[PDB]
């Protein structure tokens, strides 16, 4: 209710999904939240519903949109306490030979360099408030994912960059942390499933990937983000897993295209 009262927070990609869940969580903790999104529709709907959230149209791949975002946040609200780098994209499944260097560069511009550019421009103000940075990475940056080489690379970069930033900003008392969600039910997840030959079977496989037996919710990532900003004052450079246990224990991993022998020859 007052956990982060009067702090100014920027959330990129805050118009839907996990970002909207983070926006709602910070508004509920008393913050002024600047929603950054390339999509006017969801950001305007959130700005009208939530007093304390304002919407600024901004594409994080455009350096001038981000400079204006930071410039307007300071002009209109006088300070900056927390940046949540959430804007990102997961392409449909793609084998390595179905990827291009150009597609990889485009994904790096959004998932990695948008996060880098806003952080860099925000740091002079975060240093003045002893604020903090939260990056939304992914579990698959840590354990890999099939048919997702460009995406996995961008999220490994984000998690590592979080630790480098944590070391660079610790002399100012500025913390830098990341959240690595596993499977979270969002519009992105729904849109990816809808491209599969059996969307609900794909969703069910997504649920069975967790020992808890379900996907996570945006509100659960949101609560983790408010914790990191407002109560984790001795945490920096950590990777907070919000994954339902998906990384634990053995599971069925050998793919449908993978030659697997009968169990009378178990080790080749």
């Amino acid at each position: 209710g007052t956990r982060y009262a009067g702090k100014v927070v920027v959330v990129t990609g805050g118009g839907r999904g996990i970002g909207a869940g983070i926006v709602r969580a910070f508004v509920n903790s008393g913050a002024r939240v600047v929603i950054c999104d390339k999509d006017e529709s969801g950001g305007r709907a959130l700005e009208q519903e939530l007093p304390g959230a304002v919407f600024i149209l901004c594409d994080v791949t455009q350096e001038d949109d981000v400079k204006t975002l930071v410039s307007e946040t300071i002009r209109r609200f006088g300070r900056l306490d927390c940046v949540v780098n959430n804007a990102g994209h997961h392409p449909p499944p793609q084998r390595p030979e179905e990827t291009s260097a150009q597609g990889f560069r485009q994904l790096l511009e959004l998932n990695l360099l948008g996060t880098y550019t806003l952080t860099k421009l925000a740091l002079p103000y975060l240093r003045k408030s002893q604020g903090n940075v939260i990056n939304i990475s992914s579990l698959v940056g840590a354990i890999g994912q099939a048919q997702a080489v460009p995406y996995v690379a961008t999220k490994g970069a984000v998690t590592a960059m979080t630790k480098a930033l944590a070391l660079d900003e610790s002399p100012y008392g500025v913390r830098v942390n990341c959240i690595s969600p596993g499977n979270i039910w969002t519009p992105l997840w729904e849109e990816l499933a809808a491209l599969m030959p059996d969307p609900r079977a794909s969703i069910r496989e997504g649920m069975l990937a967790q020992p808890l037996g379900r996907m996570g919710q945006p509100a659960e990532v949101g609560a983790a983000a408010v914790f990191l900003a407002s109560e984790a004052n001795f945490c920096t450079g950590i990777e907070l897993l919000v994954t339902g246990g998906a990384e634990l224990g053995y599971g069925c991993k050998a793919s449908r295209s993978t030659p697997v022998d009968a169990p009378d020859i178990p080790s080749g």
Copy 2:
């Protein structure tokens, strides 16, 4: 204020240090807290100061003390929602040849088997409440520590056991997580430093081990424990680092007894 209202929580070793910090954090979130400690002095002082905390004398190495602890918690309060396994001990620095199998067994009884015994007896009740378990492990279970072979082994065991329990209890919706603190200023830390030839130099080295430049506080571990119990509903089997960044980046590691060559022969 109401984050964990009416939940029943048992905290072992809750009489001082990190455990007292966890006790205070759960009381402040509205829980009924059962303080388990072998030391009557600190537990009675907390029980008298905090309404909502009660003290039950209990040595977690004694199976009968733990059975009575659980039996009395259910008889007096009717449910059990959260177990925090915090009771533990760090011996003074000891080289491997200065350790004994008997000392190692004694430390396993406290740091590992006390945690196992209470968890096992608590599980039938935690399953009924869809409660959760929080184990207090240590960063050095993950990265090692010099002159601490028995201690490091016990904490590696706790962190791993947390993941095994998370897998076993997920069909009941019971989450099992651990917190791995780094250097936290507690009476244990002060007592260990007081055995060194220069206690304040040792404390200063303990502070410089973190990029943040200080040790953590019990209240910071307490906030992380309340987060795990009350708001991390999609987290299970995670290791929440509360370390000030001590695991990040390069640091000075070659010991004072270690032959290090002059910098004209950098790689032997």
Copy 3:
């Protein structure tokens, strides 16, 4: 052929399975190998087949057997260069309420304290040869396993203890490393599968747990052990995974007893 020529190596549990694979790998690299095993049958068969391997009856849970093992190795061969702590046991599947503190203590005596006791007694001689220690841990010490709380705890302890020993022994130039195998087809694996209601289905599930689509071989762990001893002179405190990729990517983890909802409610 000459990678580890004339070095003296002790392998505990070397009579069958992974230990026999390590024994054969070190003999093939030119070492004198002392097979330690509580079972005379396999050790005698290996000692007669392999010149350069000798067998010494030894139960690593008995401090006097281990002291005699070390005493006889030095008396008969004059030096000690490498200790491989491989002797260990995996109990059948057991839920937490089906485990006992006494069973847990017995498993700690073998999987953890046998490794500790031999290492401690070997260290004075390893320091003189700048030798090294290799511990055989398990992937599940890192990621957990269902129905295996005591076993998982012992292997988390071994992996952590490896790092503590690495720090303590680095001033002497003595390296301490561990190998964490995943599913390796051994007599232990076969005996555990034979206790299941459908042994070959269990073996097939064990094979499908790896992206590579098979279990590993003892000879593959053996090659990793010879690498660590003979060519990894800048590695200490590492955990060398020999797992077929089992820790990578998403897999089916929600258990058969776990309530999982239909895919029209993906996140509860």
Copy 4:
């Protein structure tokens, strides 16, 4: 001597440093080695000294140089068994505000997209030989480094991409692994130290960062690469640390610009 006999290996950046160490290690194991380097001087010197190593001028940031590299390797030698992606660069120390998006993009082109482009073009041939890929990442991709945000991001990307590739290529039996070196004494390390106000003090700090008390050698990375290619047939997606223990235990991390209080206030 014959560990990898007749296999065809491409090593990018093989003209000096770690790459030259890998080249020599694969030549010594009997392979045909194609040295890829943008620098003619070192590659020609190695090609003339080592029969079995040939040099092909190639800048991995230029897609046409890489296509020609692969085309010429197959035309001249008929197969491809192993790709070692070693070409990379570490910029001088730079604070985040001293970095540019353009510099970051240039570093991604070399450290990440050069590795991606060659792997993608090599995969059709590696699938036919059941070959393997080895990426040279860095420890700091896992633990972060100060004053190196772009570099750390590129190496986090490489390590993660290694795991994604391992999952995608396991149905073909093609393994993909990475080596994460810590401090290795190379010409790059010497050139970076020479930019410091006290180069030998910087080198000495680099040596003290390891419990072993020295930096590693290119030949030690080379031995690890030959192990991964020739004897680690059950390893895929692993990160093989060649770091001297730098990630273990506590060290001095609070920087010279970091406010650290006197030891009478240890936790703020």
